[PDB]
Amino acid sequence: TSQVRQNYHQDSEAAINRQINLELYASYVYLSMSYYFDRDDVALKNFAKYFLHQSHEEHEHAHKLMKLQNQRGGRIFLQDIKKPDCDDWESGLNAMECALHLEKNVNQSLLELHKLATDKNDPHLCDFIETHYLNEQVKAIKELGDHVTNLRKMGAPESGLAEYLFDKHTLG
Amino acid sequence: TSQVRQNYHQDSEAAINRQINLELYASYVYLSMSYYFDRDDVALKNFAKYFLHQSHEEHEHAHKLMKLQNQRGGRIFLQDIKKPDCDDWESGLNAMECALHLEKNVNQSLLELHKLATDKNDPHLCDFIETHYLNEQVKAIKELGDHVTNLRKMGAPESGLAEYLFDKHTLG
Amino acid sequence: TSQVRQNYHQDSEAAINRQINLELYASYVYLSMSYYFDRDDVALKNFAKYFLHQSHEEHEHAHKLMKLQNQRGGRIFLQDIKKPDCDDWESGLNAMECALHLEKNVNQSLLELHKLATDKNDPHLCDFIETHYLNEQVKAIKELGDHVTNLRKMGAPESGLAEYLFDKHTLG
Amino acid sequence: TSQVRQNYHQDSEAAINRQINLELYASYVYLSMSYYFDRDDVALKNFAKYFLHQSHEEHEHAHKLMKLQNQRGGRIFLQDIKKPDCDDWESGLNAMECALHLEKNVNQSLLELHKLATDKNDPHLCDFIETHYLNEQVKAIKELGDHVTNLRKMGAPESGLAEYLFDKHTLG
Amino acid sequence: TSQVRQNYHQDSEAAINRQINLELYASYVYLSMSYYFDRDDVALKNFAKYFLHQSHEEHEHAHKLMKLQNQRGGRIFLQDIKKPDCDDWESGLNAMECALHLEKNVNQSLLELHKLATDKNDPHLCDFIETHYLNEQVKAIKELGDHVTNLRKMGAPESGLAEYLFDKHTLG
Amino acid sequence: TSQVRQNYHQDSEAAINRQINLELYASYVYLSMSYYFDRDDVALKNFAKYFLHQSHEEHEHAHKLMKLQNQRGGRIFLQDIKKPDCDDWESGLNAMECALHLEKNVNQSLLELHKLATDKNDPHLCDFIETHYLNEQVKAIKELGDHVTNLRKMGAPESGLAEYLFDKHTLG
Numbered sequence A, B, C, D, E, F: 001t002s003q004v005r006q007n008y009h010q011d012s013e014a015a016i017n018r019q020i021n022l023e024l025y026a027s028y029v030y031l032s033m034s035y036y037f038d039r040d041d042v043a044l045k046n047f048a049k050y051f052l053h054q055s056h057e058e059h060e061h062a063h064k065l066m067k068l069q070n071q072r073g074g075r076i077f078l079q080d081i082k083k084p085d086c087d088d089w090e091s092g093l094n095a096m097e098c099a100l101h102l103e104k105n106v107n108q109s110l111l112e113l114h115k116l117a118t119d120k121n122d123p124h125l126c127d128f129i130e131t132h133y134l135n136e137q138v139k140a141i142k143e144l145g146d147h148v149t150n151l152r153k154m155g156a157p158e159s160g161l162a163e164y165l166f167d168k169h170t171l172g
């Protein structure tokens, strides 16, 4: 056992490792989206920039989780980072919807992690999740919902002008 | 009677209190509109910012009226601030129309207050109303009329792109 | 249902709306106190400034609650803002005591809200309440208790000199 | 009862007082260590500086706890600050190990305090402990574990050169 | 024996250790006073600040004594830091009187230490005591006497206004 | 076919995709190493910093490759990012040796890619590889060889002092 380990259950360690893998997968999905919008036949530069920024944020989240795993005396168990489900995201609106679904999945995983930590009486882990992840997820979900609503109201995905103007004005 | 009271009729005091309540109600209505446009299924951020600014201005107007009530030796009688008539404003254009109607109602109340003050030979009250409220109301009504005209000409409320572009270019 | 809603119970939404109304009522009470101390026959300017600042803070609290209501996919239901219980607060000390009672009532409402959120397993709501409201309420209650103790020890409300000197030195 | 006291159980107050005493004792232990390393026959200046800084931090923790005790309407009950268990710490590595043990004991006491506060439904106390103490304890334990690991790997306590170089490079 | 020890009698070392314990006890007493005046039912913030500053100064004095103990080749023998005699100090004036008594006790201990050092022909110790402690004690005693005289003349402890105004004007 | 595609063979596109996957895998391996050295029982902070920087550089390389894939009209085909071969790297020296082996493998893959591009008469791809990857790989291999040589000469992995001093002086 680690010399620093204290009130850190094995189930919590395993859940943290699974969350690390999930964050890495989310970063990979966002990277795929970003370079989809960099394609010559899509050419939505600010969509690509937005999704690249999201990928970097997901990477940072994974980094913070690994840092905690080391801090609490747990051991990081890395797994394969699965390829994203889709290679073509078909539009800016569809990509935004997929991002919203992914963020809600990550939020659900974090909520289950918080429930596990509460069941294990690990207040430090609960506070870490609340401070660094829960409100970030809520804000991200709200932002993606706003983007999806605006894109739908502007006439996307049928109206290419809608996605162009959203790219310029909202994501620009 | 107040030691500072001079040429301040009771009817004027009551009308000032009613105007204070009306300004508070207008602030509350604008707050409702602003947080309506902050909703995920509406997501018009600059509309929300505009209506929040209007709410703050209405609050300032109420503050100035209470300050006068104290200055003239009257006593402030606060009443319930009624909830806004609507919780869903259905569009940016409809919200702008409702704001125009509210501002015209406030203007009519101020005109009646000025008429009462003139009938009571209270030149200080008349000058206060003229200096701080009448031209502000005229400018606000003109601005809201311009916004409504522009939104109607752009194709709102049917065209969501119209309200999006108005949000970005005019209110942004 | 809102596209962003996740782990947000209806009871939590209703409690948030009630808390919004309570914060608005507290702001209104503080406004009443502030303009009571601006009266010519009271003339305690820093008491008025203090209570006006408290009113603005309460308004900000209400704003934050409405922002969360939108963030979590809930819908803001506004109610009538009831008039304050008293129009004459009879002294600086009595106003401070009433403010202390109001702050403790708000604190109790927030504690009940936190208990409800815990019962509903909504860690984001619990963390929001803890981060933004609980310690603020504790600090406000402590400050008001200090003010009340100092005013009582100085000889208020019988000693007008006591309230004058407290107005100058503590609230000034 | 205190005029500011609200949702503050007596058991929580007693536990807070015990935690205050524990923090003072930890500060005293760190002071003893620091001036042990200032001895002419030990002469590890940066070890002394490190332990003096730790003592000051422990003092600050005790200060924050007393501040909360006053804020919540509890009454501070001070006890004797027991002398440290050891007067000679025998090495830098042994002192680091003792510091790690002390920090883990403090962490366990804080976890028990958090459990008590949770059992008493005192969310403000729980949030205070999480915000100001839990992560600080985790970081301190991790840092001390790193120091102990490095000292052991360098060949301490047998190798005086190891402790000298650690004093210069890590603690310097 | 220490390699640096020269003309340092054992009795002097023991007296230095006793003085270290006395300084720590004085710091603890001042801390108790400071957080007594931070209570909601006392609420004299500048009294608390003054006594906290005194506690920090006492800590610094203890630090200097331990530094000398190491410098002269003596060994620091730490003892239990006894709890302060009183938990409730009943007023600002009573706290000031207790502080004056404590400072005079510390001064008497330092004078006995100087007499012992003179009897042992240890001029370095005598000069240390004269340079760093004797005049500091005289100044502290004079300041506390001035505070006590002013508080008594203003009408304390019966007049709460007296202690309030002293808190603002002298300690502020 | 892409409207921008010109002199871009399918085999080159597939090789570019494989190189993208290899760069992502290298970044993942470096991340694993970095957080291995952040462990409490390893505690080599500058080793962790070095490997984290290497991971970020590998990520940047992957980014540049994807950018080229889009520029030349190819389509990015992402694959699973395999978990690193090892979870425990057993020392700084062993980690450096593994990094050297990985960099040489990446260099061999890049050389095969350049050979393929030459066989396909794609001078732009050849120049891209030469400008951005070949000399970077040579420099990285040289640096890792220098690190390995220095660690071996200092007595690693048996001498923990060797790895500590290398961590401080070379990687610090």
Ligand SMILES: [Cu+2]
Pocket (backbone or CB within 6 Å): A023, A026, A057, A058, A061, A106
């Ligand atoms: Cu994330």
Ligand SMILES: [Cu+2]
Pocket (backbone or CB within 6 Å): A026, A058, A103, A106, A140
């Ligand atoms: Cu995310």
Ligand SMILES: [Cu+2]
Pocket (backbone or CB within 6 Å): B023, B026, B057, B058, B061, B106
């Ligand atoms: Cu108005």
Ligand SMILES: [Cu+2]
Pocket (backbone or CB within 6 Å): B026, B058, B103, B106, B140
């Ligand atoms: Cu208006």
Ligand SMILES: [Cu+2]
Pocket (backbone or CB within 6 Å): C023, C026, C057, C058, C061, C106
């Ligand atoms: Cu509030």
Ligand SMILES: [Cu+2]
Pocket (backbone or CB within 6 Å): C026, C058, C103, C106, C140
């Ligand atoms: Cu409040």
Ligand SMILES: [Cu+2]
Pocket (backbone or CB within 6 Å): D023, D026, D057, D058, D061, D106
């Ligand atoms: Cu501590």
Ligand SMILES: [Cu+2]
Pocket (backbone or CB within 6 Å): D026, D058, D103, D106, D140
């Ligand atoms: Cu500690």
Ligand SMILES: [Cu+2]
Pocket (backbone or CB within 6 Å): E023, E026, E057, E058, E061, E106
């Ligand atoms: Cu002293």
Ligand SMILES: [Cu+2]
Pocket (backbone or CB within 6 Å): E026, E058, E103, E106, E140
């Ligand atoms: Cu002293």
Ligand SMILES: [Cu+2]
Pocket (backbone or CB within 6 Å): F023, F026, F057, F058, F061, F106
């Ligand atoms: Cu590379």
Ligand SMILES: [Cu+2]
Pocket (backbone or CB within 6 Å): F026, F058, F103, F106, F140
């Ligand atoms: Cu490389």
